[PDB]
Write a protein that binds this DNA or RNA. Structure first.
Lengths: 189, 164, 51, 285, 153
RNA sequence: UUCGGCCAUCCUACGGCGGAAACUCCUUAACUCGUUCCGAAUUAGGAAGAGAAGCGCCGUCAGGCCCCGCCAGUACUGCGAUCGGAGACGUCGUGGGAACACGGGGUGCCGAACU
RNA sequence: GCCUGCCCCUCGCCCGCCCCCCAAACUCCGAAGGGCCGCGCCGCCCCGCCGCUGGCCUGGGCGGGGCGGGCGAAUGCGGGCG
RNA sequence: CGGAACGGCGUCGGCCGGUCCCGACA
RNA sequence: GCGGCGCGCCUGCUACACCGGACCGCAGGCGUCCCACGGCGGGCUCAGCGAGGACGGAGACCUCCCGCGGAGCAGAAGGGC
């Protein structure tokens, strides 16, 4: 059945629960891709694919968009130079009245306008190729999606300038692939 | 402080037989050793492997307190050769050992009875341990007052000269 | 199978009528003991319309 | 090894503290509600509870009206005050409890009477003068016009058992004319269809301790000196305990009115700046 | 289905950390006939429970009875307001304020008239006023701050 | 201290500090009563000990809980629009206005009786 | 590394701290919006009645005087009942 | 000229960076 | 027509925060069971972690600890304790 049909919101969030027994598994199963175990300082530049429309992206689109992005930046640089995060998860079940209540078939992620849909954490070498891979993803997803570069360091919430001052003092605490402040609360010991 | 001196609150001997003739005859052995009538404990579940059906009395126990506790604990510890593992001390301060047979206590074996082990558990207390037992103003015992596993080994080595 | 369109219009055409004044001071559902005493007190006072 | 923390931030966030006096362990709110409950048609007229509380060294009987934000104690008699009346020792025993209760009944009826100071009150309900335990119910034997002051026993977390000291005080205020509802089944001397009025008066007079004191002296004088040290020092002879309490019962009746007979350092709590420095001292390490 | 406690999951449910028995003021509050009471159901107490409709409904006491109060509530059915007389146990009834502003105002209204009899002859207007226009003021614009719409991010 | 009111600014965890009185722990089973067994509880009878606890205080970059900010005129939304847009969405009036985070600061108080 | 070993190296495993995203049948919170009710005949002093209430001389109801008063948001507008 | 994702070196208007009298090898 | 049965009733939802609101709209029940599984008073603490105890192991049973109820309350669900 076409995404020219289930694109719009016509059913209230329908999760996979005791109310949705025997649900079809999503086509997208891998949401963290690339070097997921890479450290925060390794990848300073971050990029995003946003949504220009509030719609429902299917798991087929989210998965086709994922194969497209990875293959390109990994053939252009390496599978060790970027971290690709699918920032939308297909948690809404879509119904079809097979031949009046529809049987459970397919899963749609109800994206919002102005919502991250795909993020890349990249090193200096792949800054040139990331906006290209995200462009390839745009064709796979429905709507007027729109690329952007985040003026923040990494997947962290610190701005590139903000990261420098905290890192220089040591206030910035290294927390795996992300980073948080040292905290002035809790037992001193 | 004389109010920080450890003592034996109680000794609970369990004979988990798992047969009714056997269960009752183990009640007699507990009865002779402690002089107080034991109570029976019922099965909480049915397990076919252990040959147990729910609602059936599976074990007998007597809570022996006082000098009678000290006497039975000493007789039992002697069966162990006054040797008690270092692990058997609990984080709460209590410790326990298990004996096999009853003749090793010294209760004569009679063909009228059977042969059965006792699981001796000893609970240690300090004056002031009734604050978490009183109906009125039940309050938890302060952490300092509470007996520590190491400070319990210290008390038991001094008392029955047991070695870990 | 069901509609409430025009029900409210009909209700307020000459409506939202107050519930009289008799109902407010009625003795239905009052305690029998209070009522018996109220009858005894008014009956034995000079206010009572006894023969 | 690595275990879950049962007391997480969540446990604390969802925890509902019990009522302070339940958390303290001092009050049961099931009993309290039922004692305090009056029919709404009785309005604000006070319902009075005869609260009897027993400490390690004292028995306090208190008559307590319940108000909206407070409890008003109309009259209280403490067993600490009974050597004024000639009981110099055993101030928590069964006989003391009966007399502390007798003090409560006489004191309350007299405080109410000094309000009439004229026709009928504490005199209309004189109370049993001798202390035979003989099923006295002052509430409905006679009454009419003025009625016996009514209070309901609040035993508290005390266990109501045959021979409990809580009942002793109740028989005591019932013997000073306070009407307290009873059945004479939890007071010594009751079996099936009969009540022996001697066994109740034996405990109310001290016979149980007298027999023990004499038996301890004869069997083992060493224990008698250790167990009954204060009684021996106060020169209380066992076969004279009944008269001592009998004259205390008379004395409490004659003069119920009660005579009206420091600060720890509490180191001052630090102001915020002092703590703001104390952390800095710990921080500088 | 429309049983007595249908659609009551969130209204007859205790408040987050207000579960359990109730303050004993509920059973020691003295109510008088003609008093305004607010009906707020308690989930823990089941005997004497008003229907969901009654929750949030103010009413007057018509009967003070043993154990329960009788409350007259004006329920609108269709084009008619009907007086409904419900007997509620003490757990679900709360002394209503409702007339707390009036009872205070009527008293303070007496105060100016008492002061007229005493010193302070002029009487203040005791009619309530609805705001009225702001009136004339002089404002110092010396520390004026020039605010400006700004660029988009 | 006993009884309460409202029921965490009162709870939880650990660390101190304190008791003349009070409270407690405590100390005994002749009696009473009491323990699926056990004076553990509980009932009774005490006074030889004790602050070790409970309790009263004080802590603790404590957790929680409370309060004021900020978040943020944000998110949402009542009313009007021959407003935009192909739509699903969004503006423009003209009125309402959260929340999580985050920052600071707090950590029970009352009313009777008695001492 | 070794007859083998827990002598161990890594994973699954538990436990903590983070993080991406959620819920019509989840809620610590919580709007807009709506609902119910109030917005006048107040005090003060006595006096009467009651098989009702109660330790009382207490209440509580219903009356009856007298006394210090007084009509207490806006805007519109005569309302009720067969 | 109902209309979409996407194209336009059609034409006007913007936003943000790079070089250019160190002429945008002579 | 077949097929069902939102033909009488009940719970959470859709349902739009008073009330009210629909569909052969969504996930389920009911037609019974019980002289105790009822009333009432007492006493008690629950499921469990964590540590500890002859046979005993993953699960037999006996102890302490902290246990906001994470158990139970006949049978649906949601409240309640």
């Amino acid at each position: 059945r076409p995404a020219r049909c289930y694109r719009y919101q016509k059913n209230k969030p329908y999760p996979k629960s005791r109310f949705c027994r025997g649900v079809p598994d999503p086509k997208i199963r891998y949401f963290d891709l690339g070097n997921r175990r890479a450290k925060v300082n390794d990848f300073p530049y971050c990029f995003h694919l946003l949504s220009g429309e509030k719609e429902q992206v299917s798991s087929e689109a989210l998965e086709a968009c994922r194969i497209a992005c990875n293959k390109y930046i990994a053939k252009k640089a390496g599978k060790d130079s970027f971290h690709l995060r699918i920032r939308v998860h297909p948690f809404h079940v879509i119904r079809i009245n097979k031949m009046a209540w529809g049987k459970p078939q397919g899963t749609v992620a109800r994206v919002s306008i102005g919502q991250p849909l795909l993020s890349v954490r990249c090193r200096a070498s792949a800054k040139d190729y990331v906006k290209d891979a995200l462009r390839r993803a745009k064709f796979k997803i429905p709507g007027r999606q729109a690329i952007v570069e985040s003026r923040n360091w990494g997947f962290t919430e610190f701005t590139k300038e903000e990261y420098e001052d905290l890192r220089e003092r040591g206030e910035l605490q290294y927390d795996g692939n992300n980073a948080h402040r040292i905290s002035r609360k809790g037992p001193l010991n | 402080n004389p109010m920080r001196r450890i003592r034996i609150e109680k000794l609970v001997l369990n004979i988990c037989i798992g047969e009714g003739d056997a269960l009752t005859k183990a009640a007699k052995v507990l009865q002779q050793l402690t002089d107080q009538e034991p109570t029976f404990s019922k099965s909480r579940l049915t397990i076919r492997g252990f040959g147990i059906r729910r609602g059936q009395k599976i074990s007998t126990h007597v809570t022996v307190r006082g000098e009678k506790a000290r006497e039975i604990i000493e007789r039992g510890l002697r069966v162990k050769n006054f040797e008690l593992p270092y692990s058997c001390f609990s984080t709460t301060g209590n410790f326990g050992f298990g004996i096999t047979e009853h003749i090793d206590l010294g209760i004569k074996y009679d063909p009228s009875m059977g042969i059965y082990g006792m699981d001796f558990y000893v609970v240690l207390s300090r004056p002031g341990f009734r604050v978490n037992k009183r109906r009125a103003q039940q309050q938890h015992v302060g952490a300092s007052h509470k007996i520590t596993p190491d400070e319990a080994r210290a008390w038991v080595e001094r008392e029955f000269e047991v070695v870990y | 199978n069901h509609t409430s369109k025009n029900q409210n219009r009909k209700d307020h055409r000459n409506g939202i009528k107050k519930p009289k004044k008799s109902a407010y001071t009625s003795h239905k559902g009052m305690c029998p003991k209070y009522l018996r005493n109220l009858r005894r007190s008014r009956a034995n006072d000079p206010r009572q319309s006894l023969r | 090894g690595w275990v879950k923390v049962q007391k997480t931030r969540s446990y604390f966030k969802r925890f509902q503290v019990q009522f302070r006096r339940r958390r303290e362990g001092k009050t049961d709110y099931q009993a309290r509600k039922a004692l305090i409950i009056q029919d709404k048609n009785k309005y604000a007229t006070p319902r009075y509870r005869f609260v009897v509380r027993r400490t390690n060294k004292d028995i306090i009987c208190q008559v307590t009206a319940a108000e909206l934000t407070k409890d008003r104690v109309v009259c209280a008699a403490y067993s600490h005050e009974l050597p004024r009346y000639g009981i110099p020792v055993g101030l928590t025993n069964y006989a003391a409890a009966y007399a502390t209760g007798l003090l409560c009944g006489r004191r309350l009826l007299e405080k109410l009477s000094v309000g009439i100071k004229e026709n009928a009150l504490a005199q209309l309900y004189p109370g049993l003068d001798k202390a035979t335990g003989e099923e006295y119910h002052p509430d409905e034997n006679e009454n009419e016009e003025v009625h016996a002051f009514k209070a309901f026993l609040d035993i508290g977390l005390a266990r109501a058992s045959t021979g409990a000291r809580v009942f002793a005080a109740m028989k005591g205020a019932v013997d000073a004319g306070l009407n307290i509802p009873h059945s004479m089944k939890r007071f010594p001397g009751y079996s099936k269809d009969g009540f022996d009025s001697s066994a109740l008066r034996d405990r109310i007079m001290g016979k149980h301790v007298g027999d023990y004191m004499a038996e301890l002296k004869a069997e083992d004088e060493e224990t008698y000196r250790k167990r009954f040290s204060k009684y021996i020092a106060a020169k209380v002879e066992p076969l004279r305990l009944e008269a001592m309490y009998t004259k205390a019962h008379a004395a409490i009746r004659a003069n119920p009115q009660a005579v009206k007979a420091k600060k720890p350092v509490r180191q001052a709590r630090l102001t915020l700046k002092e703590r703001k420095e104390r952390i800095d001292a710990k921080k500088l390490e | 289905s429309q049983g007595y406690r249908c659609k009551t999951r969130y209204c007859f449910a205790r408040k987050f950390r207000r579960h359990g028995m109730a303050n004993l003021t509920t059973y020691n509050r003295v109510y008088k006939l003609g008093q305004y009471v607010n009906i707020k159901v308690n989930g823990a107490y089941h005997k004497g429970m008003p229907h969901r409709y009654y929750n949030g409904r103010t009413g007057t006491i018509f009967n003070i009875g043993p154990r329960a109060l009788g409350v007259q509530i004006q329920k609108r059915v269709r084009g008619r307001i009907m007086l409904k007389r419900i007997n509620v146990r003490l757990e679900h009834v709360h002394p209503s304020d409702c007339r707390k502003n009036h009872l205070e105002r009527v008293a303070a209204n007496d105060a100016a008239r008492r002061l007229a009899k005493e010193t302070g002859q002029p009487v203040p207007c005791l009619k309530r006023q609805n705001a009225l226009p702001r009136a004339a003021h002089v404002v110092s614009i010396a520390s004026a701050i020039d605010i400006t719409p700004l660029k988009y991010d």
